[PDB]
Nucleic acid binder design. Structure first.
Ligand SMILES: [Cl-]
Ligand SMILES: [Cl-]
Ligand code: NA
Lengths: 67, 67
DNA sequence: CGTCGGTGACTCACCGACG
DNA sequence: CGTCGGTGAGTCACCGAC
């Protein structure tokens, strides 16, 4: 048939668009998950940097009041 | 008669597909929200650390101005 | 002002879990 | 052994873009 071919290729083009939709959503989820993991490592390292600095600051303040 | 046992399975799968699609979108929203707050939180921590780095330095200088 | 692709939702195929 | 639910994938109906 000839209408059966217009319907067949339409089903093919749409099958690919569905796969593109699903793949884009998966790549988006991967991207976000990779980003949160990285931002959580940065936050942890900053919280650790801040903790050492607060310690160093208080040691120096007490060294300074000892004349 | 046997068409009812098949309507009931399509319903059960209809419910499972819905629950499945929903969880996917919920995960994306959580991550997008988490990225947003982690970017904000890290900018606040990053400046906290810069300020501490300067306070420690000024303190190291004040210790040497007293031998 | 007519096709195009994108997308929500139903459905089926397939798989591992498991009573 | 056989049914279950989760999930990938094909399909339909519909819509906005252009
Ligand atoms: Cl199911
Ligand atoms: Cl088309
Ligand atoms: Na639904």
């Amino acid at each position: 048939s000839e209408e059966e071919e217009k319907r067949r290729v339409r089903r093919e083009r749409n099958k690919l668009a569905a796969a593109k939709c699903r793949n884009r959503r998966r790549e988006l989820t991967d991207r976000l998950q990779a980003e949160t993991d990285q931002l959580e490592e940065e936050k942890a390292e900053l919280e650790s940097e801040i903790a050492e600095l607060q310690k160093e600051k208080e040691r120096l303040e007490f060294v300074l009041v000892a004349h | 008669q046997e068409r009812i046992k098949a309507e009931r399975k399509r319903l059960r799968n209809r419910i499972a597909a819905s629950k499945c699609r929903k969880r996917k979108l919920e995960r994306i929203s959580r991550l997008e929200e988490k990225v947003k707050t982690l970017k904000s939180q890290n900018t606040e921590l990053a400046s906290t650390a810069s300020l501490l780095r300067e306070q420690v330095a000024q303190l190291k200088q004040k210790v040497l101005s007293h031998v």
